[PDB]
Every structure is written in C-alpha cells, then in structure tokens.
Amino acid sequence: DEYTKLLHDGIQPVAAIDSNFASFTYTPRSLPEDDTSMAILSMLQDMNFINNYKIDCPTLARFCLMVKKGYRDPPYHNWMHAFSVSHFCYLLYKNLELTNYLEDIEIFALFISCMCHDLDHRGTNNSFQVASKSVLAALYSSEGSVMERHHFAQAIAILNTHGCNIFDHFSRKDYQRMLDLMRDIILATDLAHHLRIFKDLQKMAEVGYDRNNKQHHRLLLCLLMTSCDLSDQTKGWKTTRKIAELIYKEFFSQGDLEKAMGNRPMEMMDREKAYIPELQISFMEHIAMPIYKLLQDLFPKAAELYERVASNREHWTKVSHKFTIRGLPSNNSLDFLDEELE
Numbered sequence: 001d002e003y004t005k006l007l008h009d010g011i012q013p014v015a016a017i018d019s020n021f022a023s024f025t026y027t028p029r030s031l032p033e034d035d036t037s038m039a040i041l042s043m044l045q046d047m048n049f050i051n052n053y054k055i056d057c058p059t060l061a062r063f064c065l066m067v068k069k070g071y072r073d074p075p076y077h078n079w080m081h082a083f084s085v086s087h088f089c090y091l092l093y094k095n096l097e098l099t100n101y102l103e104d105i106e107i108f109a110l111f112i113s114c115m116c117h118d119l120d121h122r123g124t125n126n127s128f129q130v131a132s133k134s135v136l137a138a139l140y141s142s143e144g145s146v147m148e149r150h151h152f153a154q155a156i157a158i159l160n161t162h163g164c165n166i167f168d169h170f171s172r173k174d175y176q177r178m179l180d181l182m183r184d185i186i187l188a189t190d191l192a193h194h195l196r197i198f199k200d201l202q203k204m205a206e207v208g209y210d211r212n213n214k215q216h217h218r219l220l221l222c223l224l225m226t227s228c229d230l231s232d233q234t235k236g237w238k239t240t241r242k243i244a245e246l247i248y249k250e251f252f253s254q255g256d257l258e259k260a261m262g263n264r265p266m267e268m269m270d271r272e273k274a275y276i277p278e279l280q281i282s283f284m285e286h287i288a289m290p291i292y293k294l295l296q297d298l299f300p301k302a303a304e305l306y307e308r309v310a311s312n313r314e315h316w317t318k319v320s321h322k323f324t325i326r327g328l329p330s331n332n333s334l335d336f337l338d339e340e341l342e
C-alpha cells in the first residue's frame with residue numbers, strides 16, 4: 001500500500017538516498033518510481049520547509065500521493081517528469097544557495113509548483129495557435145491557449161480535497177500568497193509566456209539581479225521554473241537521447257491521429273517531416289541554451305549547466321552530420337547512437 005508504505009517510510013535524510021543526490025551530475029530518473037514520493041518528502045525536509053511552515057506530515061503524504069496520481073501515462077508528460085523537475089528545483093536550492101536571493105515562501109512555492117505543473121497532461125499539445133506548421137513558428141510564438149491554467153486548477157482541486165490541504169493552517173494572507181505564487185509559476189511553464197518575458201529577463205541579467213527588487217523576484221522565479229522544466233538537457237548524452245525518444249513518441253501519437261483524421265499536424269509531430277536531431281538542435285539553440293545562459297549570467301555556479309546543454313547540442317550536431325533520422329523506428333529507440341558517439 002503506497003500510503004501505509006509512505007507513512008512507514010517516515011522522512012529519510014537525503015544521505016539515505018544517495019551521496020550524490022544534491023549533485024548536478026545526479027540523474028533523478030534513475031530512482032525507482034516507487035521511491036519517488038519518499039524522495040519528495042526527503043527534499044522538503046532537507047530544505048527545512050516541513051518544520052519552518054509546520055506542515056502536517058500525514059497531510060503532506062496524502063498530498064504527494066494525490067499529485068503523483070494526478071499524472072497520466074503519456075511517454076513524456078508523466079509523474080517521472082514532474083519528479084525530475086522537482087528534483088532540479090532542489091538542486092538549484094542546494095547548489096545556487098537560493099535562500100540568499102529569494103524568500104523562503106517563494107522557493108517553497110517553486111518546489112510545489114514543479115510537482116504540480118503538468119497535472120493531468122494527456123500527451124497532447126494544441127496550444128501553439130500558429131497558422132504555419134513550421135517548427136520555427138512554434139519556437140517563436142508568444143501567444144497560445146494556455147493549457148497551464150488546467151494544470152493549476154488540478155493543483156487547487158487536490159488542495160481542496162478533504163485531508164490534502166498542506167497549507168490550510170496558514171494565515172489567510174500567506175495562503176493567498178502561496179496560491180498566487182503557484183498560479184504565476186505554473187503559468188510560467190508556457191513557452192509562449194517565456195517568450196513574452198524574455199526581453200525582461202535579458203534586461204534583468206544586464207543590469208544585475210537585485211534581491212530587493214520585487215519584479216526581479218517574479219522574473220527569477222519564471223526563469224528558474226523553465227530551467228527546472230528543461231533540466232533533462234543538463235545531464236549526459238543518455239538522458240537527452242532517451243528524453244528525445246519520449247518527447248517524439250508522444251508528439252507522433254498526436255500527429256499520427258491528426259493525419260489519419262485528415263488534418264495537418266505541426267511539422268515536429270509529423271513523423272514524415274520530423275528530423276529529430278535537427279529539431280533537438282533547433283530547440284536547444286532557440287530555447288534551452290539561452291535559458292541556461294541567462295541562469296549562468298545571474299549565477300556563476302550555474303555555468304556547468306549551460307556547458308552540459310551546449311555539449312549535448314554538439315552531440316546532436318554530430319548525430320545530424322552522420323545520420324538522417326526522419327521520424328522514429330518501429331521500436332521508438334535511438335539507443336544505437338550511444339555507441340556511435342562512444
């Protein structure tokens with residue numbers, strides 16, 4: 001039983017999970033899925049949020065289980081994505097020393113937002129609102145349908161479930177503050193939102209981060225959230241390769257249906273038009289690398305993250321020069337590439 005087992009698991013120290021658990025080299029997708037709820041509790045305890053906010057541990061256990069259950073099983077947008085995004089939030093706390101830059105409550109909200117940010121994703125994305133089917137239209141678009149309102153609504157539905165409100169003992173002001181933070185942070189996972197605020201993020205990085213500037217706190221939270229969402233690109237080759245398989249398996253299931261029903265899919269969802277290495281390069285150069293470059297500009301200790309993403313972009317570039325990979329094979333695996341690179 002998940003609940004009894006999670007109650008019996010108490011709250012472990014992070015040293016009981018792995019000595020590298022707080023390292024940027026750690027791959028949280030290596031952790032067995034049955035141990036991830038325990039790891040969530042361990043991270044919250046290690047960041048001192050359980051004690052400092054007087055969180056009821058049974059209520060938190062139930063909350064964690066409800067959030068996990070609120071994910072479906074498409075290839076990419078599942079609980080293991082939310083878990084690995086949440087783990088990266090913890091890595092930023094530990095390695096960038098976020099308490100020196102943000103309030104305790106903003107960091108707590110960021111972590112809970114990471115857990116909840118893709119709730120009830122069904123492996124479909126019809127959000128781009130572009131007339132072209134080109135990947136470039138998608139990579140530049142700053143408007144869309146905002147699916148992220150639903151993810152937030154699912155989070156609030158969990159909090160409004162009897163026995164699951166981890167914040168119900170908060171003051172009315174702190175309760176509203178937490179929910180407003182969750183809304184803003186979850187809405188920030190929309191790439192259209194990121195593209196709307198990009199110029200303001202650049203301006204912040206140019207002038208320098210001001211810990212006394214409240215607009216800078218807002219912008220930084222958005223940047224950190226997107227950096228958590230894309231953190232699979234900051235690990236090694238095997239992670240970026242595996243995640244590309246998942247992203248495109250998910251995309252192609254949508255696109256295959258759209259094509260079958262006589263509709264034009266986005267080109268990145270059309271297995272006949274989607275050159276995966278080239279698409280990965282484009283996403284990394286347009287979206288991911290600039291995010292981690294901004295992060296490095298604000299936090300010199302984040303330099304290794306940018307350099308990992310850049311290294312992974314160069315791996316995909318080598319792949320693109322040696323292979324023409326249009327769509328995915330019938331088994332959805334490009335794992336032969338691991339031996340090709342070394």
Ligand SMILES: Sc1ccc(Cc2ccc(Cl)cc2Cl)nn1
Pocket residue numbers: 135138139140191230233247268279280283288
């Ligand atoms: S790391 C990563 C993350 C997402 C995607 C798919 C993808 C998603 C959105 C856009 Cl606008 C473009 C692409 Cl190509 N690919 N790689």
Ligand SMILES: [Mg+2]
Pocket residue numbers: 117118189190
């Ligand atoms: Mg999302």
Ligand code: NA
Pocket residue numbers: 077
């Ligand atoms: Na996503």
Ligand SMILES: [Zn+2]
Pocket residue numbers: 081085117118189229
């Ligand atoms: Zn996500």
